[PDB]
Write an enzyme that holds these catalytic residues in place. Structure first.
Site, mmCIF file in Angstrom:
data_model
loop_
_atom_site.group_PDB
_atom_site.id
_atom_site.type_symbol
_atom_site.label_atom_id
_atom_site.label_comp_id
_atom_site.label_asym_id
_atom_site.label_seq_id
_atom_site.Cartn_x
_atom_site.Cartn_y
_atom_site.Cartn_z
ATOM 1 N N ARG A 47 32.512 46.119 45.200
ATOM 2 C CA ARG A 47 32.357 45.299 44.001
ATOM 3 C C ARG A 47 31.650 46.073 42.889
ATOM 4 O O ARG A 47 32.040 45.971 41.713
ATOM 5 C CB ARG A 47 31.607 44.009 44.341
ATOM 6 C CG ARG A 47 31.397 43.089 43.140
ATOM 7 C CD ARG A 47 30.678 41.819 43.533
ATOM 8 N NE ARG A 47 30.274 41.028 42.373
ATOM 9 C CZ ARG A 47 29.022 40.691 42.089
ATOM 10 N NH1 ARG A 47 28.029 40.947 42.914
ATOM 11 N NH2 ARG A 47 28.757 40.078 40.939
ATOM 12 N N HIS A 59 33.460 46.522 39.308
ATOM 13 C CA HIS A 59 32.917 46.029 38.046
ATOM 14 C C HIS A 59 32.551 47.153 37.102
ATOM 15 O O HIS A 59 32.507 46.946 35.880
ATOM 16 C CB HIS A 59 31.714 45.135 38.261
ATOM 17 C CG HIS A 59 32.085 43.766 38.705
ATOM 18 N ND1 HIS A 59 31.285 42.673 38.485
ATOM 19 C CD2 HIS A 59 33.209 43.302 39.293
ATOM 20 C CE1 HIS A 59 31.871 41.598 38.982
ATOM 21 N NE2 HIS A 59 33.046 41.952 39.471
ATOM 22 N N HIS A 66 39.516 41.733 48.534
ATOM 23 C CA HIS A 66 38.828 40.557 49.055
ATOM 24 C C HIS A 66 38.882 40.455 50.571
ATOM 25 O O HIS A 66 38.246 39.565 51.152
ATOM 26 C CB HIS A 66 39.361 39.315 48.346
ATOM 27 C CG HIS A 66 38.849 39.202 46.949
ATOM 28 N ND1 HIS A 66 39.405 38.381 45.988
ATOM 29 C CD2 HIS A 66 37.838 39.859 46.337
ATOM 30 C CE1 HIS A 66 38.733 38.516 44.855
ATOM 31 N NE2 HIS A 66 37.774 39.404 45.042
ATOM 32 N N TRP A 80 36.586 35.419 52.269
ATOM 33 C CA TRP A 80 38.032 35.256 52.290
ATOM 34 C C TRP A 80 38.610 35.483 53.674
ATOM 35 O O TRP A 80 39.681 34.935 53.988
ATOM 36 C CB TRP A 80 38.693 36.269 51.352
ATOM 37 C CG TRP A 80 38.409 36.081 49.897
ATOM 38 C CD1 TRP A 80 39.154 35.386 49.012
ATOM 39 C CD2 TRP A 80 37.294 36.612 49.159
ATOM 40 N NE1 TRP A 80 38.584 35.440 47.771
ATOM 41 C CE2 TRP A 80 37.439 36.191 47.837
ATOM 42 C CE3 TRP A 80 36.209 37.427 49.488
ATOM 43 C CZ2 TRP A 80 36.543 36.559 46.841
ATOM 44 C CZ3 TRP A 80 35.323 37.785 48.496
ATOM 45 C CH2 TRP A 80 35.481 37.334 47.199
ATOM 46 N N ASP A 84 42.998 33.938 43.317
ATOM 47 C CA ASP A 84 43.740 34.336 44.507
ATOM 48 C C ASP A 84 45.009 33.492 44.635
ATOM 49 O O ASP A 84 46.100 34.007 44.906
ATOM 50 C CB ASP A 84 42.885 34.139 45.772
ATOM 51 C CG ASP A 84 41.578 34.928 45.775
ATOM 52 O OD1 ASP A 84 41.582 36.144 45.501
ATOM 53 O OD2 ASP A 84 40.539 34.307 46.096
HETATM 54 C C1 HEM Z 1 41.711 39.813 40.729
HETATM 55 C C2 HEM Z 1 40.668 39.285 40.047
HETATM 56 C C3 HEM Z 1 39.284 39.164 40.700
HETATM 57 C C4 HEM Z 1 38.455 38.118 40.611
HETATM 58 C C5 HEM Z 1 38.655 36.798 39.844
HETATM 59 C C6 HEM Z 1 37.294 38.375 41.437
HETATM 60 C C7 HEM Z 1 36.227 37.522 41.624
HETATM 61 C C8 HEM Z 1 35.210 37.717 42.523
HETATM 62 C C9 HEM Z 1 34.085 36.832 42.738
HETATM 63 C C10 HEM Z 1 33.883 35.487 42.014
HETATM 64 C C11 HEM Z 1 33.315 37.383 43.687
HETATM 65 C C12 HEM Z 1 32.011 36.827 44.295
HETATM 66 C C13 HEM Z 1 30.754 37.582 43.844
HETATM 67 C C14 HEM Z 1 29.570 37.014 44.586
HETATM 68 O O1 HEM Z 1 29.331 35.771 44.463
HETATM 69 O O2 HEM Z 1 28.879 37.768 45.326
HETATM 70 C C15 HEM Z 1 33.926 38.629 44.088
HETATM 71 C C16 HEM Z 1 33.467 39.432 45.091
HETATM 72 C C17 HEM Z 1 34.065 40.589 45.543
HETATM 73 N N1 HEM Z 1 35.092 41.234 44.900
HETATM 74 FE FE1 HEM Z 1 36.421 40.296 43.642
HETATM 75 N N2 HEM Z 1 37.439 39.624 42.001
HETATM 76 C C18 HEM Z 1 38.642 40.134 41.561
HETATM 77 C C19 HEM Z 1 39.096 41.387 41.835
HETATM 78 C C20 HEM Z 1 38.520 42.303 42.675
HETATM 79 C C21 HEM Z 1 38.946 43.668 42.862
HETATM 80 C C22 HEM Z 1 40.051 44.328 42.045
HETATM 81 C C23 HEM Z 1 38.182 44.202 43.812
HETATM 82 C C24 HEM Z 1 38.213 45.612 44.402
HETATM 83 C C25 HEM Z 1 39.346 46.278 44.624
HETATM 84 C C26 HEM Z 1 37.248 43.193 44.248
HETATM 85 C C27 HEM Z 1 36.319 43.309 45.257
HETATM 86 C C28 HEM Z 1 35.383 42.372 45.623
HETATM 87 C C29 HEM Z 1 34.509 42.411 46.779
HETATM 88 C C30 HEM Z 1 34.558 43.517 47.841
HETATM 89 C C31 HEM Z 1 33.708 41.338 46.740
HETATM 90 C C32 HEM Z 1 32.639 40.911 47.781
HETATM 91 C C33 HEM Z 1 31.240 41.348 47.406
HETATM 92 C C34 HEM Z 1 30.161 41.063 48.425
HETATM 93 O O3 HEM Z 1 30.484 40.557 49.531
HETATM 94 O O4 HEM Z 1 28.966 41.355 48.093
HETATM 95 N N3 HEM Z 1 37.474 42.052 43.522
HETATM 96 N N4 HEM Z 1 35.080 38.822 43.351
HETATM 97 O O1 LIG Z 2 33.550 37.136 34.328
HETATM 98 C C1 LIG Z 2 33.315 37.152 35.484
HETATM 99 O O2 LIG Z 2 33.663 38.236 36.426
HETATM 100 C C2 LIG Z 2 33.293 37.802 37.815
HETATM 101 C C3 LIG Z 2 34.562 37.722 38.562
HETATM 102 O O3 LIG Z 2 35.305 36.579 38.154
HETATM 103 C C4 LIG Z 2 35.399 39.014 38.342
HETATM 104 O O4 LIG Z 2 35.184 39.907 39.405
HETATM 105 C C5 LIG Z 2 32.705 36.472 37.613
HETATM 106 O O5 LIG Z 2 31.912 35.815 38.565
HETATM 107 C C6 LIG Z 2 32.648 36.142 36.267
HETATM 108 O O6 LIG Z 2 31.602 35.382 35.716
#
Ligand code: HEM
Ligand SMILES: O=C1O[C@H]([C@@H](O)CO)C(O)=C1O
Ligand SMILES: O=C1O[C@H]([C@@H](O)CO)C(O)=C1O
Ligand SMILES: O=C1O[C@H]([C@@H](O)CO)C(O)=C1O
Ligand SMILES: O=C1O[C@H]([C@@H](O)CO)C(O)=C1O
Ligand code: NA
Length: 250
Positions: free
Chosen positions: A38, A42, A163, A179, A208
């Site tokens: 993540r 980001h 995810h 997930w 998703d």
């Molecule tokens: C497609 C649009 C995406 C959205 C809307 C999205 C949204 C989110 C959100 C809301 C979280 C939760 C953060 C938290 O509460 O800790 C998250 C976590 C995460 N995202 Fe996504 N994300 C996206 C794309 C990606 C991409 C492209 C990657 C990497 C290739 C990624 C990797 C991760 C990982 C590994 C976590 C887990 C973090 C943890 O367990 O600490 N995400 N993402």
């Molecule tokens: O704008 C944002 O980015 C993250 C996620 O949607 C993208 O990884 C999230 O919690 C928002 O507030």
């Protein structure tokens, strides 16, 4: 041929390899691969090709970017990695955080993503608000990944497969849950969970679910759910591109 990578010194390359080894050990030992993926995402995903601002240029070390709402909790990741960074002053933060993302995928069983050094640490963070909104759908995904970052629909679906690692936290994003049943295992299970619908104990975001209803994204979900090798190949290509947005462009 879209890329022309810079020459770095032998000492720089040696530091990359020694840092990679330290990162592999720390990320495995502390079980923090999802947070590190993540962090790298980001860091990179703020690139906008129209202004060539944002992208993987080390700005997640900047407190103003860490304070963006979307980056809640990434301050933990920055702090966890700082002891290693202190041992490698020659490396840019930009390279270091992308290397951490590549290592996170490796240590959890995912593909080997090529890594090319030389990113600069740029002084200004991107404006807040470039990253995708989890409540929005396919049009928004195409604006963010396609129009801002310059990535393809295949890249969107493959990268969403990240995810397979980790979870949402109520104090970070406000969503809560993993997930997949194996949040430290990098596999194609995210797509399988999407296709089977919601189930107790697992989470799906609206973003998703947008992959299932879109006529171009859905065949890719189907492919990756059935064929982990195809997923790993497309993921590797997409992560490489993501990690190099705005960097070394020919
Ligand atoms: C497609 C649009 C995406 C959205 C809307 C999205 C949204 C989110 C959100 C809301 C979280 C939760 C953060 C938290 O509460 O800790 C998250 C976590 C995460 N995202 Fe996504 N994300 C996206 C794309 C990606 C991409 C492209 C990657 C990497 C290739 C990624 C990797 C991760 C990982 C590994 C976590 C887990 C973090 C943890 O367990 O600490 N995400 N993402
Ligand atoms: O704008 C944002 O980015 C993250 C996620 O949607 C993208 O990884 C999230 O919690 C928002 O507030
Ligand atoms: O993936 C993560 O790693 C840490 C912790 O779970 C293990 O260090 C953290 O808070 C995450 O979100
Ligand atoms: O280590 C720290 O944790 C808090 C904050 O990041 C908690 O979310 C912060 O200000 C410190 O410097
Ligand atoms: O439930 C769903 O969420 C997305 C989109 O509506 C999010 O805004 C969509 O395509 C689904 O079918
Ligand atoms: Na998993």
């Amino acid at each position: 041929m879209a890329k022309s990578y810079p020459t770095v010194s032998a000492e720089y390359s040696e530091a990359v390899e020694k840092a990679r080894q330290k990162l592999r050990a720390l990320i495995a030992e502390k079980s923090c691969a999802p947070l590190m993926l993540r962090l790298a995402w980001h860091s990179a995903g703020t690139f906008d090709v129209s202004s060539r601002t944002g992208g993987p240029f080390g700005t997640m070390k900047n407190p103003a970017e860490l304070a963006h709402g979307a980056n809640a909790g990434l301050d933990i990741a920055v702090r966890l990695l700082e002891p290693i960074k202190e041992e490698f002053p020659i490396l840019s933060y930009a390279d270091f955080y992308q290397l951490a993302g590549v290592v996170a995928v490796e240590v959890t069983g995912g593909p080997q993503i090529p890594f090319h050094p030389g990113r600069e640490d740029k002084p200004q963070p991107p404006p807040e608000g470039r990253l995708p909104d989890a409540t929005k759908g396919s049009d928004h995904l195409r604006q963010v990944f396609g129009k801002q970052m310059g990535l393809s629909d295949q890249d969107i679906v493959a990268l969403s497969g990240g995810h397979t690692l980790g979870r949402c936290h109520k104090e970070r994003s406000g969503f809560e849950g993993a997930w997949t049943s194996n949040p430290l295992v990098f596999d194609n299970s995210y797509f399988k969970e999407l296709l089977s619908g919601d189930k107790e104990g697992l989470l799906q975001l609206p973003s998703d679910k947008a992959l299932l209803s879109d006529p171009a994204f859905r065949p890719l979900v189907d492919k990756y759910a059935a064929d982990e090798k195809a997923f790993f190949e497309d993921y590797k290509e997409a992560h490489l591109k993501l990690s190099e947005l705005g960097f070394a462009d020919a």
